Every structure is written in structure tokens, then in C-alpha cells.
Structure 1
């Protein structure tokens, strides 16, 4: 009753660094179908994202020359990214160990799953793939403030691992980099990669009365559970990317220790002290 999963199937015949888990992007492995799936996904997202995605995201797609019609060549994209913020993307097989992921970010390397979902999975894939990782995550790396936030997040991995607090950082990442909203004078916009690559979450997170929208608060977020297989019950809202970066500056160690003893908020809870939008 067990068959190899998509990550295993896609990486047949390929290898990865046993410590940093990178490989050269295997350009030869992309089929015509892959390029067509990419183009379909790209087109679908670009139709639905105007007035929903933050303006910086859509600008980043353009400035980085993210291919509309084929899976991007990572090396070519890196020429633009490096000149902008000194970041680059690196190819990985799929999910990688946490300390490796943090080490990458700490060194301004963004790990991107190299392979793409199959066409029958157009609507949704549970695993990260190159569409979610590249299209969703990479365009904001052109923004120097957002890029510094990621670098600072990466550097915080060492302290968090030493204190048994990686899950608390994982929650911060989830509720910002993956599922964050940013308020603007024009209305609420989206910066989270998991929403930006989604067929439908883009609609729900802005239009539905169902989810909570709560002002960003570092300690609250680090004490908040999430689930991976459903639309978010709570979205955290920032005023600016500067708020994220500034949140990483003070000593996180006493926050971890105070939370180690604590009971976390459920994914759909509102805390007594929340600023509820």
C-alpha cells in the first residue's frame, strides 16, 4: 500500500549534498509538459493577483524577468537577484533539514525545489514545488528590507536550535513569509508565498469574513499553531516590511524560554490582546 512519493519520483537518478542539500538545477529534466504547466500556472496567478498581491511582488516578477512561458533558468535569474540585493537561489530536491534551510537564508541563499507539479495537480500540491518556491517566494527578494528580514530570520536559527525553539521560528516564517498580509492605504494586500501561488486562497484571505486578520505581534505569532492542509484560520497583518525586520533585532532568547513553558494558541484562536482587523 506504499508507493514512492512525488519528491522521490522526481529525484530518481539525481543526487544532493549530504550537508547543504543543493544540486545544480537539472534543466534537461524539464519536459514540454512542465513548461506548459508552468506557463498555465504563471498566467493563472497573474490574472488573479492584480489588486490582491502587494505591488512589490508583481514588480519583482518583472524586474527579475521571471519567465512566463517556461520553468526559469536559476542561473539567469540569479544575475538579476545578485545585482539587486546580493541574494541568489539554489536548487534543492524538495523539503530539506531545518538547520540547512536556516544556514542558506543566513548566507543569502534561497532554497527552491527544482521540480514542478504534474498537470493533474495544477490546482494544488501539498509539497513545495518550483512554482510555489520560485514564483511565490522569490520576487520579494528584490526588496532590500524583505531580503534583510529573511537573512536575519536565517541567522536566528542557531539560537533557536540551541534552545529547542525551531518550531517557534517555523511559526513566524509560516505566518509571515508563507501566509502574511500587508495593510496598505489601498486596502489589504498579500505578501505570503503560500497565498501568492494558490489558486483560491488569494480570494478567501481578502474577501471572506471567515478568517481572522490580526495585527502582527512577534511573541503572539511564535506561540501560535498552524495547520498545513487547509486555508489559514488566522492571517497576521504587517504595516511594512520594516516591521518584520525590526522584529528580529532584539534578543529572542527570553521569548523562547517564556514560550517553552506556555500553551500555544490554536490556529483559529483570538488572543485577549490581539489587534483584530
Structure 2
């Protein structure tokens, strides 16, 4: 019969929750996420010195690479986020500020999340233009790469492109397709999402650029993706969806889309077939 799925934005309330100093701090952010309910403003957090230092390093080094590595859409929106949301080396932007900025631009909003959601629950958020975001900062011992998403990933990887209409449409349509879909179909949609939204490359004016959020937040994988010692294939959902998504390491393969508009059409033809 059909599995449960959210029918309105507030239904997301029902799934979004499914060293010792670092540990206690993580519990703090986890508790803020767990007590959030739709309609709340997202709790604003005073970040520690060390958290800002880690952000500063990440922000400083990624901004050296963006102009030559990032797709034009990412670069177009980056300065608006500086101006309106307080993106600076010495300040971590607040999810509530970024949420409000997105609401105005593409209708996207943010909801804080404590841990990993299932791909079904995560994608279901996108159906309502809701992006579930972590609020904590990666451990200071590896600024260049982390196997778990942190707030730098959400803020630097995802938000600039969620502010772009063509890209927000693409994202929402993946979400909409997943609503009440089979387990097989959800896995394919999530893999397609992984190799576009998360780790996607694109061709712009003949050059390879990155739009994948997991790449735009990692100093070392961003450089690696365009080095180019990376194996790259054309984006094609029927083949892309079978590709294994790697956690804990760099990807073994990245997929190239022609444009956000084109990747959206490819996904449209594809979802018809599943």
C-alpha cells in the first residue's frame, strides 16, 4: 500500500528526529535539534573560539579555490550570503539567518537536525523545500575533510546553490519523486542526489566545475576532484543510480552534468521509469 510520508511542511516534525568537551558540546546541538518544532525560529548559537577558528580555516582556504573550482551559480550567490548572512572568516553564520535569506530567494528553508536521517526522511524534506542541516562544527583535527556532515558543509556546500531557482527546483523534484516511493526507488533517487547535489561536477564554457556540496565544503576533495587524477563519467541516472556512494573516503568516480536545467530533465525522464 503506500508507506507514510509528510503531506505538509509541519509533518516533518514526525520524522526529523529519527574528548568529553567535544562530546558534551555535540549533545548541546543534538538537544537543540530534538526540541525544534516547525514554526520555531531556529535557535541561535554562540560558537566557541575553537569552533570559529576551525570555520575560519575552512572558509579562508575554500575561498581561495572557489573562483577557479566552483560553478558560476555558486559564485554568483556567494557575495549575497556574505552581505546579508554574516559569512566571514571570524563569524559562523546562523541557520535562522540563512533560512530567512533562502525563504525570500527560492522559498527554501532550514530545519536543524541532530543526526543522520534516512534518505527517505531527508528527501521528503526537499519536497517541501526544507533542508535538514547540522548545526555543529567539524572536529578541529581535520578541517580539510570530515567523513560526517557538519555546519560548514551545510553553510558552504549547500546554501549558496539552494539560493539559485534552477537548482532549488531540481532539488525539490527529487524530493517530490521520493514521496511514498518504493525502497528501491528511494535508493536510486538518493544515489542520483548523491552524484549531483552532493558530489556533482558540471561543464561550463567547456571547463569542469564543481557544484557538489560535499566537494565545496572539503578543501582536499575540492582540489582532488579537478586535479585531475579523478575518474569522471557523464551523468545518466539509469547508470549513475547503481554507483556505490562512498563514505569515509574520497569518491572513486564523479559525474558530470551539462547544466542544472539538463540534469533536471534527465531526472524527469528517469523517474517515469521507476
Which structure shows the higher helix fraction?
A: 2
Same fold (TM over 0.5): yes
Cα contact 2:199–2:213 (8 A) shared by 1: yes
Q: Which one of 126, 137, 141 corresponds to residue 105 of structure 1?
A: 126
Output aligned runs, 1:50-65, within 5 Å. Answer: 50-65=67-82
Which residue pairs with 2:55 in the alignment? 38
How far apart, in 2, do the equivalents of 1:59 and 1:124 lie? 25
Q: What does residue range 161-240 of structure 1 map to in structure 2 within 5 Å?
A: 162-208=182-228, 210-240=229-259
| TM-score of the aligned structures, taking structure 2 as reference length | 0.81
Q: Aligned partners of 1:8 and 1:254: how far apart in 2?
A: 47
Measured after TM superposition, the shift of residue 156 of structure 1 is 1.5
SS in 2 for 1:166: helix
Verify the 8 A CA contact 1:85 1:147 in the aligned structure 2: yes
Confirm or deny: 8 A CA contact 1:140 1:147 kept in the other structure. yes
Q: Which sections of structure 2, spanning at least 5 residues, go unmatched?
A: 1-18
Q: State the shift of 1:54 in Å.
A: 0.8
SS in 1 for 2:73: helix
263, 267, 270: which one pairs with 1:244? 263
Q: 1:21 to 1:173 in 2, by over 3 A?
A: farther
Q: Does 1:89 align with 2:105?
A: no
Tell me whether 1:153 sits opposite 2:174 in the alignment: yes
1:231 to partner: Cα distance: 1.9
Structure 1 residues not aligned, in runs of 5+: 256-277
Secondary structure at the aligned position of 1:120 is classed as coil
